[PDB]
Design a protein around this ligand. Structure first.
Ligand SMILES: Cc1ncc(COP(=O)(O)O)c([C@H]2N[C@@H](C(=O)O)CS2)c1O
Ligand SMILES: Cc1ncc(COP(=O)(O)O)c([C@H]2N[C@@H](C(=O)O)CS2)c1O
Lengths: 413, 413
């Protein structure tokens, strides 16, 4: 895996911000795209765009083969058994809402539980809050250990035979924790529950095998894995999708439409109402071809290296706290002792460095961490150790800068 | 309006299919894109892609300004009063389902009516079928006159003081009828109802002014108006959106998230859950800039010319029936007397000509027309009279070809 050659493929990395080379360390907010993906969208709109399915003309057939071809690339990429289990959506958030609408609201009754965890992103909290309110069921939280991991004993304790759904992040977008999904799916199933896995932050960065995980549903976003924005996937075991009703209705997802009643198409098209995200899904297929050619295991190994290097270099800084476990995905969320993380992010952008500040859509987690906000540097296959040196040098300079503003503000007062 | 110069801007038009120049006459299934739109997506992914809102770094701010800037272009384009009334969705079909979920299901009770029409597309039928079934309300249909238009007396008759929602197409994707939306909105409102307008086929082709129409909601698709796929808009009057709950839940559309309860952001972001369709919405803004520079009124006048020319030349063909009224948008749906429309479409694609065959997602309408399927040629700003001559010449050749296959099949038997 050669990082110079990989970087050459991402035009956006080769520019300056505020007079400094860009150092983009915000791929957990979104990833950048290689020329293979952007040129795939260009070739689609330059050469073969047309609406898909019922192909009667040559560009229609080409577009259709492109769109359904990308469906097959996705199925192979996550090791699903069938294309019928691969639904294109506009993103992880929509995929999780479809499960909460079409599965949870159809299957929960008073006394049923949905169990989630304190580290979940909002997209894997609010749909359940709403679905339990709608059905009179109960929402429960699995507690965290003090390093921000989950113990399977806590899982066993929290999940009961009234639990119908466990929903849990594969990888935390804040802590970098990789959760024990395969063993949690066993506990869910032993209790008569399904497990819903939020794979938004795992799928770009590590190999996903839904047969090995034995997850009932798995949601992911293209924009985080070198693909176009506005596109996602919901995977669900075929036997569960077959018994779920559509979450929206329209053209393309019907078989017969009468004045008052309609019947639906087979899977996966039952869940794809209206003209689909044709260019975006084909560009997500090109992203997958791109990542597979590099190797997901090579990408994970590179990120392990960057994360171990980052945590070590963060520990060399005084006055900095890093949240979450030592063993982790390719991101670091942190605070400088005396500086608001928004000011940290603002100053780092003056040195060309892009990180994020805020709650990262995990308010209950920030509460658990006893903070109101954090800063986050997150990595991907185009980032390097030198970029991490630049970050840790700028955090040092940031600390000195703010301690000097303060020291000299109180020689004023 | 110079059609040579406009055609020069659409790379996809300049190729051959089956050894003939392409003649694309299927823009009602989807439109082709000018270089200004494709190069807008390229510049986004080559230069300033980043996740949007809470901008702390320079590419983030640029992406955010791009995305919210396109929101303002849309508001101005349909003459909405406020950006709070412009919601980005993945397409017309999703926009209409959001109204059926968040407005209709919250506001219908037994004895309430939703009134639609026999010419509606499935996307403006099935969400209502489902919403009335969910609430025990009643669905009614406004009848059509024999030329496929709607009479306002029929509207007055069908809409009553129990009607809460009238939902109706601005322009029919099959008949080419332009419905009297402004006068229908008066009748809805006089009866205490809201009107939901499906503008998928009007917005690309004619000026839309939501203040003049006084529609309560209006839905449209980018892919039909020179923009990227996977993107749409729901407009709704601000006072109605303010009282509607979100149709999906997650990050970005909240203000506070506790363990069990959450509060939502203000409009429009209350309705935009998760990372939005950032590239697609910015490319929809570039499509709008493109169409506005040509002039929507100039585009409508060009299509009036093409439609009047087409209907006249179709009447010169023997054995061909055209459905719908003389005064119409830029499309013609038709059947050849003795040939299935799928075979018509297949043969026309052998001569480079792209049209569609099927029910066009309007099964109740095909039933009303007493046919099982139709063929459809549909026009846009890059099509010419010469392309219409090619179509009518190929339909003539198609008729002779099939009458000769038949004549000589029965000199065999
Ligand atoms: C673990 C996890 N789950 C779900 C989501 C929502 O994904 P989206 O619907 O693509 O915005 C995310 C998103 N979080 C945002 C972030 O971490 O900055 C951008 S992707 C995520 O990280
Ligand atoms: C009048 C009318 N209303 C709603 C839709 C659905 O729009 P989409 O959600 O972009 O597929 C359509 C779609 N009909 C398809 C067609 O006519 O071929 C492609 S756009 C439409 O024409």
């Amino acid at each position: 895996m050669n990082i110079t050659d990989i970087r050459e493929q991402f035009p956006i990395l080769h520019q300056q911000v505020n007079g400094h080379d860009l150092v983009y360390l915000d791929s957990a907010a979104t990833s950048q795209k290689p020329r293979a993906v952007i040129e795939t969208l260009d070739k689609y709109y330059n050469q073969y765009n047309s609406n898909v399915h019922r192909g009667v003309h040559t560009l229609g057939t080409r577009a259709t083969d492109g769109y359904e071809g990308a469906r097959e690339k996705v199925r192979k990429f996550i090791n699903a058994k069938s294309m019928a289990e691969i639904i294109f959506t506009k993103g992880t958030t929509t995929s999780l809402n479809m499960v909460a609408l079409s599965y949870a609201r159809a299957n929960l009754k008073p006394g049923d539980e949905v169990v989630i965890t304190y580290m979940e992103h909002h997209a894997n909290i609010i749909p359940w809050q709403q679905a339990v309110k709608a059905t009179g069921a109960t929402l429960k939280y699995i507690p965290l250990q003090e390093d921000g991991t989950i113990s399977l004993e806590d899982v066993r304790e929290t999940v009961t035979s009234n639990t119908k759904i466990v929903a849990v992040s594969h990888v935390s977008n804040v802590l970098g924790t990789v959760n024990p999904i395969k063993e949690m799916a066993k506990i869910a199933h032993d209790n008569g529950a399904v497990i819903v896995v939020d794979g938004a932050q795992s799928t770009p960065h590590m190999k996903i095998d839904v047969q090995d995980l034995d997850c009932d549903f798995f949601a992911l976003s293209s924009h985080k894995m070198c693909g176009p924005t506005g596109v996602g996937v919901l995977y669900g075991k075929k036997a569960l999708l077959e018994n779920m009703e559509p979450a929206e209705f329209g053209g393309e997802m019907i078989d017969f439409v009468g004045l008052y009643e309609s019947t639906w198409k087979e899977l996966p098209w039952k869940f794809e109402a209206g003209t689909p995200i044709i260019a975006g899904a084909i560009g997500l297929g090109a992203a997958i071809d791109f990542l597979e050619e590099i190797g997901l295991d090579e990408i994970s190994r590179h990120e392990h290296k960057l994360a171990a290097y980052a945590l070590e270099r963060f520990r060399q800084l005084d006055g900095v706290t890093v949240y979450g476990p030592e063993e982790r995905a390719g991101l670091v969320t942190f605070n400088l002792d005396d500086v608001h993380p928004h000011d940290v992010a603002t100053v780092l952008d003056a040195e060309g460095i892009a990180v994020r500040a805020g709650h990262h859509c995990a308010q209950p987690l920030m509460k658990w961490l006893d903070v109101t906000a954090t800063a986050r540097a997150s990595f991907y296959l185009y980032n390097t150790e030198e970029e991490i040196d630049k970050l840790v040098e700028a955090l040092q300079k940031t600390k000195e800068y703010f301690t000097n503003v303060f020291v000299d503000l109180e020689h004023h007062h």
